[PDB]
Every structure is written in C-alpha cells, then in structure tokens.
Amino acid sequence: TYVSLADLERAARDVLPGEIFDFLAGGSGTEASLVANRTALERVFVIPRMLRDLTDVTTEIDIFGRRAALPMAVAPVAYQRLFHPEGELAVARAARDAGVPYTICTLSSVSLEEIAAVGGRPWFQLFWLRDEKRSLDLVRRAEDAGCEAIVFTVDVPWMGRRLRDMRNGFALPEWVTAANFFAPATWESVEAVRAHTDLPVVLKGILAVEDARRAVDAGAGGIVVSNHGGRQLDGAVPGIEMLGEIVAAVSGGCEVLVDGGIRSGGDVLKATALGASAVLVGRPVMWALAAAGQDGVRQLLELLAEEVRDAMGLAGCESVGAARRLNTKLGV
Amino acid sequence: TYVSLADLERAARDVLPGEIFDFLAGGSGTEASLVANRTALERVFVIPRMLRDLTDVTTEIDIFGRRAALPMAVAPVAYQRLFHPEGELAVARAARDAGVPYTICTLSSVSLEEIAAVGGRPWFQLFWLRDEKRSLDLVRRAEDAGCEAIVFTVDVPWMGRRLRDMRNGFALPEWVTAANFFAPATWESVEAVRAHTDLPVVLKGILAVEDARRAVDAGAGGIVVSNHGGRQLDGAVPGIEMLGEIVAAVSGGCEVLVDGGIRSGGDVLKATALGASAVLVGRPVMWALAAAGQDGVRQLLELLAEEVRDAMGLAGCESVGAARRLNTKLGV
Amino acid sequence: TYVSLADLERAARDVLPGEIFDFLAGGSGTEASLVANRTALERVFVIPRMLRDLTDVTTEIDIFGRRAALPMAVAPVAYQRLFHPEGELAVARAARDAGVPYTICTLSSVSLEEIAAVGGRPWFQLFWLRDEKRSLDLVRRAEDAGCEAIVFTVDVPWMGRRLRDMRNGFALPEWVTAANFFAPATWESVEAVRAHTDLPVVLKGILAVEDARRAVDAGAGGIVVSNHGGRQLDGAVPGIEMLGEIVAAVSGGCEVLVDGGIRSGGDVLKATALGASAVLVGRPVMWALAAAGQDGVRQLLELLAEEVRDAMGLAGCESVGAARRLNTKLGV
Amino acid sequence: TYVSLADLERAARDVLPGEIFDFLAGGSGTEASLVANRTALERVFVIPRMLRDLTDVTTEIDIFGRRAALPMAVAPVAYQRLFHPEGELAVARAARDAGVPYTICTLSSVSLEEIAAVGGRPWFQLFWLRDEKRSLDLVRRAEDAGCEAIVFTVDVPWMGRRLRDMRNGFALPEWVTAANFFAPATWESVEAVRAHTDLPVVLKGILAVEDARRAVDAGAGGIVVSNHGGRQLDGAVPGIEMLGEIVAAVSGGCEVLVDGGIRSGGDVLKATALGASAVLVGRPVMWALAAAGQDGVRQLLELLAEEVRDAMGLAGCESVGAARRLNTKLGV
Numbered sequence A, B, C, D: 001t002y003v004s005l006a007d008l009e010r011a012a013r014d015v016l017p018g019e020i021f022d023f024l025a026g027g028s029g030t031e032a033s034l035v036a037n038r039t040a041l042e043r044v045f046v047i048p049r050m051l052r053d054l055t056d057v058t059t060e061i062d063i064f065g066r067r068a069a070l071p072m073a074v075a076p077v078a079y080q081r082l083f084h085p086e087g088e089l090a091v092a093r094a095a096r097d098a099g100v101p102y103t104i105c106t107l108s109s110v111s112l113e114e115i116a117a118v119g120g121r122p123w124f125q126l127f128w129l130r131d132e133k134r135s136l137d138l139v140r141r142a143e144d145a146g147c148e149a150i151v152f153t154v155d156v157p158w159m160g161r162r163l164r165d166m167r168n169g170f171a172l173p174e175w176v177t178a179a180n181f182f183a184p185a186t187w188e189s190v191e192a193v194r195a196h197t198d199l200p201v202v203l204k205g206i207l208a209v210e211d212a213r214r215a216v217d218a219g220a221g222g223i224v225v226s227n228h229g230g231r232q233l234d235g236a237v238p239g240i241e242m243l244g245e246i247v248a249a250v251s252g253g254c255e256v257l258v259d260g261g262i263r264s265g266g267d268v269l270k271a272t273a274l275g276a277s278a279v280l281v282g283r284p285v286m287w288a289l290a291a292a293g294q295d296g297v298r299q300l301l302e303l304l305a306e307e308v309r310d311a312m313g314l315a316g317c318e319s320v321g322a323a324r325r326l327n328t329k330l331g332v
C-alpha cells in the first residue's frame, strides 16, 4: 500500500535509471525554486472551521465546462515513455477512470490523437513553434481530437539550465520521440491562438500580478500560476506565494490554477484556501507511473482523492467553494 | 528523579511497545501540526516583571465553579490501559491528589462511573455519536456520576490519517476496550447538549476566531483552542498561535483554554501570558503513566507544579491573573 | 595566542572539571534564553559609516563619575575560586590594569574588602537578604571599602532550575565559601538602598519597558537590561531585544547597560549601536581566569579592547557616542 | 566543463595551497558578513514577466562612458600572482576579450602600466596613502596609462581581523610584491581626488543611505554598495540588503553598483532587479585564475554571460533596463 505520495517517490527512485530519475526530479540552476515550491507550502497553515454540516462532503468542481472529481488535473509532463512503456496512455487511462483532467503535451511520446482516444477530459498543452503555422495546426488537431482546453505554456522561450542533466550527459533514448511531429511566445501569439479556437485558452507560467490581469484582458479562460516546477528561471518565486495576490487582482475574471510542489491532499486544501480554482500535479503522477504503470497512477489518484476529502472535512468544508473561503496563517 | 517532562518521554519510550509509543506520539499526515505545536511555543519569549511582592505566590485558579491547584487539567486521552494496567484509575487518582481536574474520555478503557468514583474534579469529554440518543445519555451518565463540565470535542468527524499507525498495522489489544459501551457534530448538537445539562459545556478543538465568538453566542462556558495535538487536520494552525486573537474576540465571555505541546511550567506561563485561562496536557501525562503508573503521574504533576511556581515567581507574578497580564515577544 | 573569545572557551573546557564547566556554561530549564542571547546578537547587522576622521579613535567612556577604558565592565559572577585559586583577586587585578570596572559579588569567594584593596574601579553587586539589616550593612561595607556603584540584582528571588547542576549533583567544594559572611527584593528595598547610600544604584535584571521607566522614577543611576545570562527565567526575552525600546523610554534619565552573550568587540559595537551605555561580560572573563589566571584575564581584556577599537573604526566611529548613533538592520 | 561557478571553487580548492585558499575565501571575525552576503542573495526571489519580445536579448550596458558586454566588472582583488603565475595579466586579458571592465588594484602584483597595456576597459582602484602625494600620483599614473574610472575604496582604514590568516600564519610569498611601489580616507580625500582627475570617481564600500547621498553631493560618478566581501567589519550589513534603499535615495544621481556573494547569472539578475547598474565579482574570478589561468577566467566569463542571458530571457527581459524594472519577493 502507498499511504503518502512520498511512498511513491521512494518506489520510483528504486525502479528508474538514475539519469531518468534526475531528469524528472531536477530543477534549473541551484534548484532554489524547486526547493522553495516545497518550503512555501510547508509554511502555510490552515485555520479550520468546526461544527458545520458534513453530510455530503464533495470534492467535485466545475471547470472549463465540465465536472472534475477533484480540484486537480494531471500537469503536462513531456515524454512519459521515459518512465514506463505505456507512457501517456497509462496515465490518461487512470486519469479518465478517476474523473481527473489529463493534459496532453505538445512533446508527448504518444500522439495526441491516440491519447485523446482514451477518452476522459483531455486538455492540450501548447508550446509555440518557430514555425508558427505548426502551432495553430497543433491547436486545431487538438480541438478536432476532442481536447477541451488549450494550456498555452508561456515560460519556455528555451529550456532552463538543468545541471543534473548536463552532469549526467542526459539525452532521450532512441525509443522515446516527440510523437506529434522553442520560439518565444508573445501576447500576439496568445491572440492568434484565441482567434483560432473557441476552446478556453489557459496561460501557464504566469507569476506577475500584472501578467495575470493582462491575461484576463487578453481573453484567457484561465491561468496557471507556476514557476514550471522550478525547472525554468532559478530564483523565480513559487506560484503559491503569488497566488493570493493574483486571485485578488483577477476578481473572478478567469480560473486561477496553481502548480509546483503539491504532494498531498492537504497541499491541495492549502492551495484552495489561498484561492486556487484547482491545482496541477506533475512529478508525483510520474512517480506512480514509474512504480506501477496505469495501476500505480490509479492508486495515486485514489490516495489523493481520499486525502483531499479527509482534509476538507477535517477543515469543516463540505465543498471546494467552502475551502476557498478558509483563512490561513504563515508559520515558520 | 525526573527533572523535566522530557525525562519522562525517554522513560516511556524505554518501557512501551513501539507501536503503542507511536500511537501516543504520532500525528496525522506529515506531522506538520505536531511539530508546529512545539515550534510555536519555542518562539514565544516572556517579558518578566521585577521587584513585585512574592510573599504568597499562588498557582491556583477558579474554573467552572471550583478551585484547581494549577492552571492545568489532564487532557482527554482515549484508552489509557494501553499505557499501564491501571489505566485511567491511576491517572485520575494522581490528578485528584494533586488538585488538578481530570478529563474522563468517551473512549475510556475503564467506565466513567468507576473513574468518577475516584473523586477529585472529574470533567467528561463527549464525542457525538451517530446514534444521537446515546450522546445525551452519556452526558446524563456523566452528570449523574458527578462530572463538573462537559468537554465536547468537535474536531473529530472522523479520525485523521495516522501514518505511523497505518505503517505499524496498529490496533487495540484484545484487553483494551471502550468501557462506556463518529458522527459529525454541528452547532445543533451543541444546543442539544446545552439544553440537556446545567453543567458548563466546553467546546474543544476551536481554532477560528469566528468559531470562538459563535461558541460564546451558543452558550458555551469555555473553549479549548486546540488542533488535537496535531492528530487531526495535518497543517492546522497551532492553538497557541490563535490564542491571543481568540482571547481578544471573546472579551471574557467564556473561559479560553489551550492545548498542544505543553512540556513545562514555562510553557504554561507562556500560554497564560497569551491569555489562556488554563492549559490541557496530554502526552506527558501518558509518559508518566507508562513509566511508573500512579506514582509516575504524581511525580509529573509535582514537577509541573514546581515549574509553574518557579516560572511565575521569576516572572514577577504572585497570581495566575498577574501572569495573564505579562507581555511576550516572538523570537527566532 | 588567543585570537577570539571562543579560543578561551575551548581552553577553559580543557582545564576545568566538567561539573564546574557546566555550572559556568549552563542556563535554566531548556536553556532557551541562554541560546537566544546568542541568536539575538547574531541577527543584528551594523550599517557602518565611511570617510569620517579616525585620527584619534577612543574607546573610553565616562560612567558613574569615572573614566573607563572601554564601554564594558566585568559582570558579577559568584564564587570565582571555583575557576582558579586566585579567584576574584586575579580578575580584579587584570580589570584594574585594563581600566575596566570590576563588579564585586555579594557571593564572592574572597571578601569584598580584600578585592576592593586591589584598587581600580570596583562596583559592588547586592543581593537582598531575608535578614534586611545584613543588606544595608553590605551596602555600607562596600561604600566604606571604596566601591563606586551598587549593582542591585533584582531577578533572583530564588535560583532558577539549573538542570545541568541537578544532573551533575553539583555543589560548592569545601574550599569555596561565601567570604562576605535569597529574599525577594521589591521597590521598597530599592528605596531603602537609595536612602542608605549616595552611590549610584544600578538595577540589574530589568527587561520590561515600564520597569525601566519606574527605575528612573525610583532614582536609579542606571539599569542593566539582562536575563541573567539565561540562568533565571527560561524563556525570558534577551536583554539585547528589549534594549532599543528601553533606551527610548528612559530618555537619557539613567545609564542603560546590557548583558548576555557578548563574545566579541563587534558584539560590544552592536550593543552600543542599539543604545547601550556599556555592556557587562560574564562567562568569557571566567574562561580566561580558568585558562590562565590573572594573565589570562589580562589577555582577554587586551583582545576585547583591540576588537572594540577595530569594530568602531571600521564602522566610522571615533568615539563611543558616535557608535551609539549608528543604525542597525536585523538579518536572518 | 564547468557548469556553475561552484565548480570553479572546487577546482581552485584542489590546486591552491590551503593558506592561499584561506586568504582568498576568508572574511573577518566570525565571518558573519561573509555568510550573510550569500544568505541575502538566497532570500531574494524574482517575479518574472512573460510573453514579451525576446527577439534581441542583449546583456550590454553603458557605464562610465563605454559599453560593457555584461552588467559586471572584475572586482579589485590584491596580489593576483598569489593564485597563478600570470596574475593580473591573465585576468585582464580574459576580461578584455570578454568585453568586461577589469579593476586594476593599488596592491597589484604586476604594475598598473603593464596591466593597462593589455587594453580593454581598465579601471583603477585607489587606496589612500599616509603619504598623500603618492595617492594623487597613483591617480595620475592610472589616468596617464588609460584607466577609465577611479574606484576609491573607502572601507579600509586598516585591514580587518582575518582569523584564518592569523591561525595559518599567512604572509606574502617572497615572489609576490606590491608592484606599483593604509591612511583613513575622508570626504576631504574624495574632494582631492575629484579635483585631480576628470575621470569618474566611484566610491567603493558605501553601505549607509546618507553616505550614498553625500557621495552624489560630493561629485562621485558612482558608488559600489559593498561590505568588502565580508572581510572588513564583521557584522556589516550585506550590500544587497541596502541596495534598494540606496538606489531610491540616489534618484539616478550616480551609478549604483553592488558586490559581495555574486555566484551566478541569476544573482546578477537579482542585483539588477533590486536596482544595481552593475555588479562586481571577486572570488569566483580568482577561482578560475587559480584553476586554469587566462583560459579559466575566459571560461568563467563565458559561463557568466550565458547565465545572465538565460536568466534575463527567462524573466522576460530583453535588456538590462527591463531587468531593473522587475519586482522581487523575499523568501525563507
């Protein structure tokens, strides 16, 4: 049995080759932002409410048209065949069965149409290409295959400095490819995407308050407050530390998701209490995939669902909206 | 000789089976709140007063009708026969002899009437039952047996995630039972209890300021500001960190107790200086019981009494009321 | 050569019996205040001034009538024959030769008249006795022997809980006695002392702002902001953390000294910059005495004098008054 | 390959004699300020901007008349033949080739005319001499040799207490000399220098806001906010912690540089975001010189240039001016 997400990290470290575990675990530079994502969540304490009706605790949310079983989606993580032979199909099947949205990557190692054919709630994560037209073509491919939202990742004009990868001499195995086959994206790219599709466009990698405001003005349906899991700018603030200010600035004008460092249902509760609509979870999903394939991811999502229900009810929240109204206190 | 409560922890760790020591010591989840209870007290420094009359330093208080020898009571801890064969009777006898209130548990391993027959100042701690009527029946049983206050624990709609217990496969030995034999309690349950008894109702597990205010409005005679020793919501704020704000909000409308992490008479002084009427002490009482039964608990209460007197007088306080008027400073 | 006061601590630990080193080093309780005295100084950073005239840097001050070579005096430390056979005479001779005031203890292991006969600038530290009349008699004895100030220690209604001493079973060797041969002192005792002598009365152990104000109103010539080296109330705030608020409240109405944790000339500079008139130094003087007797104390005072001159000049201060006008910043 | 500046520190520790590595690495006193320079940078997080045009990211700045390839110069470090036989010539050649200003030291181990003959952008760092006239003569020598700015170091009325050097018995080898061959400098010295040369005078070692303002009033063309790498006053605030307040006080009246602890291009970005015109880098340049002479310094400057470009672009900054408008957040 796994009783925490940390149990899955230990299992994945046992099974994966060291250089693949380091590609997964590592951040850029000194890994200051990778560590700070965890420090920031550990400093947040919740002030629970008592004596409220918990007859029907529900962890469901509605987001981008549709019901999700938890306030969580699987983050976009490139090249999932690095971690298990079934790669993205194993994760997308488990996400579908758990009622959790799965984000299909531009750099997926199985084609986006095959993963979308699994069913469930697929979103599609876009990187802008130097060849523009390939960008809007991926978007249209995703929409034609049934993806529900376009998650436009905006924090990768190029890959950050991954010193573990450099020191390991890491490269993709011959058997892992970009099965769908960086330019800096700008606000003009966002408008090109928004014009090309009626799906909600979600800008992922926003940390500045004024960029969140501009995203609403630009017609985004959501943002993901994120420093890319500490893998891009080393020293970028954690998303969790900007979330409350961004939620206030947005005034309900779009959905505000957060990612980076979510390692338990209690962390999901903290993100909700700071105002997030939902969270993304990246590395833990890959730990479960590495450890035990589709069944591993299933067990992870079952464990997270139980932890979120436990934390919500112990905090007096019968719904995710109630959890958003909880207050927090920073500790040491 | 034990010269600190930490000496008793070391003695109990020697004698108890590991899985029982872990049931006692552990918290929920990552044990963030278990640790934070201690961190929070360690950050509080007292500003002592000098040159005041200390001719007659007294640690006594009046609470819920009656005199207590110290501003402290034994917290409700279920199943005390886990720790020593005499269980609750050993602890209740030592508490009586020390002039300290003892809280009889709904989940006591000796019946509440037997423990109440020990004498002293017994309080009774209630859990709300799915069978309501059993709830009001326990209350009436407690009142009929001479209990002085009903401590209604409101932070357990269900048991939190005790990972030590899960990993140890912990269960009650066959020889430990609930000798008096969870539903979520609500404010309606509180009113049902308040209507059923003329004893003071004390709501235990309050952390939000508005819940403390509502408790006064609901007719509570006291509250215990508490995160259940870090055993329920992992990431719940320590009670000590909410205490000052709650004492201000209550405006003397009820007694305000605190628990979590009290490990010395100096910690009692800090809680008093932050405004507590009294503290509860949980794990250290069980350490003394495990180490040396009734005589162990007696020695613990003698040591705590000496530490409280020492700290009060060194801080210039001839009474607990004077200690409540001390100022504090947070450190690092 | 000793190049820091920490070199002397290491030397004293080598030479002294463990239980005597623990009597010297230890604090009360968990030693929270003993540690916090050091933490508090380590958090203070100085903002130095540049490009000022340093032609004649002087570390001298005038205090309680007389010139001192440094803004420092030897703290009162009982029973100095515990540390070296010459005890107080060795320390008082070195202090005299360095131009530093030496505080003669009520509990000195050489009589106050013998130590005063060494010469120099002796102050006398008073404990109030249950036999009052013995108190005013010690004061008159000190004045008759040439002491310049009465340092009335007010934070010892009784000795704090010294767990090292308890665990070691520590007691005075037969060869160490109180050669001049606790009741709680009150403000009435202060007035009795102030009436009995024309010497300045300095109240040692003040931490609350209103007690500092009351000391000025009571006719004190000085106060020592102090938690008794962390040896009395465990959890008492460090004096360094109250110093700035106290200096502001006093408005120049008396001298404001500080002690606790001074381990370098840079620490003296920090205390001055926070507003202290001078500091006391306790344990390091005993380390030097243990290590090398009178010559050890001489070397310590020479090293401290050089460190204070170095720090003052590097901070742009040609006088201690200039150092008091420096600004500080708290760090981590 | 070196992939971080920390790789070069490890290489230099391998090659240099321990006492020379300690002369380079060490600070004064307890090395509180040496450590705090690093702590202060590690607490700064950047809030990056997204979706801006990065077609032409440039790290160039204009400073003191001339273009520099990065917002950085080589700090003045005395006696560089301690670290490699080619000493200052190796470093100045690599700096020239990288388009980075090199600061020639008053205490250089190769004469200032020889180093200036390397070409590039040489600045000259002045110490004030007890023989004044030698001071203005060095200035005129530097100007005659083509130096572009006079960096007047004002924080060394004498050398701080270098306990590593004392404990190692460190002295200059016979083969290292002051090839150009302390008095306290004052504002009058600054005016003497400003009158003697039309080059910009840059005062290095300013930490107080009012000294920065006075520097502008005195006609300085720049200041370096600096605690001398933690080598002078132990307990002096880090320059990075004063930088923002100083930049605000100066109101664009002079260039404001900072040094101390810069160990990556991300640290350069943080200093820029706090308002620095440019940084100086000291110890890492000497690590590269020790490790591999001129080619080592070349590799260091190439690595720093790539790290600055990476950090700027990941933070959405196409120019150093844009990076100065970034906001920051302090973390833990």
Ligand SMILES: Cc1cc2c(cc1C)N(C(=O)Cc1ccccc1)c1c([nH]c(=O)[nH]c1=O)N2C[C@H](O)[C@H](O)[C@H](O)COP(=O)(O)O
Binding pocket: A023, A024, A025, A037, A075, A076, A077, A078, A105, A106, A107, A125, A153, A156, A158, A159, A160, A204, A226, A227, A228, A229, A259, A260, A261, A262, A280, A281, A282, A283, A284
């Ligand atoms: C752990 C991991 C995270 C990510 C990726 C891969 C790995 C192993 N991807 C890439 O390598 C993309 C790339 C970038 C540069 C060069 C080649 C490929 C990836 C990505 N985000 C995204 O939009 N698309 C991606 O394709 N990320 C961030 C992820 O979406 C979340 O932001 C964090 O994982 C939340 O933090 P976590 O829960 O603490 O892990």
Ligand SMILES: Cc1cc2c(cc1C)N(C(=O)Cc1ccccc1)c1c([nH]c(=O)[nH]c1=O)N2C[C@H](O)[C@H](O)[C@H](O)COP(=O)(O)O
Binding pocket: B023, B024, B025, B037, B075, B076, B077, B078, B105, B106, B107, B125, B153, B156, B158, B159, B160, B204, B226, B227, B228, B229, B259, B260, B261, B262, B280, B281, B282, B283, B284
């Ligand atoms: C250490 C311990 C504490 C408690 C318990 C047992 C143990 C070993 N109890 C239960 O397992 C109840 C239960 C819950 C879920 C499933 C079965 C039983 C218990 C309880 N509080 C309460 O109302 N009634 C209880 O019956 N608590 C908290 C206690 O009252 C104090 O809140 C903290 O002990 C102060 O923190 P401490 O001084 O640092 O320890």
Ligand SMILES: Cc1cc2c(cc1C)N(C(=O)Cc1ccccc1)c1c([nH]c(=O)[nH]c1=O)N2C[C@H](O)[C@H](O)[C@H](O)COP(=O)(O)O
Binding pocket: C023, C024, C025, C037, C075, C076, C077, C078, C105, C106, C107, C125, C153, C156, C158, C159, C160, C204, C226, C227, C228, C229, C259, C260, C261, C262, C280, C281, C282, C283, C284
């Ligand atoms: C380290 C030490 C300090 C002190 C003492 C002895 C020792 C070894 N004395 C006693 O045992 C008095 C006593 C108390 C209770 C029972 C018997 C004797 C002593 C004293 N202060 C004072 O008025 N008179 C004293 O007779 N102190 C505090 C001292 O004056 C300074 O407050 C701190 O030493 C600054 O902190 P430091 O620089 O970090 O050490």
Ligand SMILES: Cc1cc2c(cc1C)N(C(=O)Cc1ccccc1)c1c([nH]c(=O)[nH]c1=O)N2C[C@H](O)[C@H](O)[C@H](O)COP(=O)(O)O
Binding pocket: D023, D024, D025, D037, D075, D076, D077, D078, D105, D106, D107, D125, D153, D156, D158, D159, D160, D204, D226, D227, D228, D229, D259, D260, D261, D262, D280, D281, D282, D283, D284
């Ligand atoms: C690491 C080092 C730094 C410096 C020096 C030598 C060493 C090995 N110099 C001296 O020994 C001068 C001296 C002083 C007293 C007695 C004899 C000689 C030196 C200097 N600054 C300056 O104006 N001129 C100098 O001649 N410094 C500071 C340097 O300019 C930077 O302020 C810090 O190096 C940024 O911090 P860093 O990037 O973390 O290293």
Ligand SMILES: [Mg+2]
Binding pocket: A258, A259, A260, A261, A262, A279, A280, A281, A282
């Ligand atoms: Mg996450």
Ligand SMILES: [Mg+2]
Binding pocket: B258, B259, B260, B261, B262, B279, B280, B281, B282
């Ligand atoms: Mg407690």
Ligand SMILES: [Mg+2]
Binding pocket: C258, C259, C260, C261, C262, C279, C280, C281, C282
């Ligand atoms: Mg001291």
Ligand SMILES: [Mg+2]
Binding pocket: D258, D259, D260, D261, D262, D279, D280, D281, D282
């Ligand atoms: Mg630097």
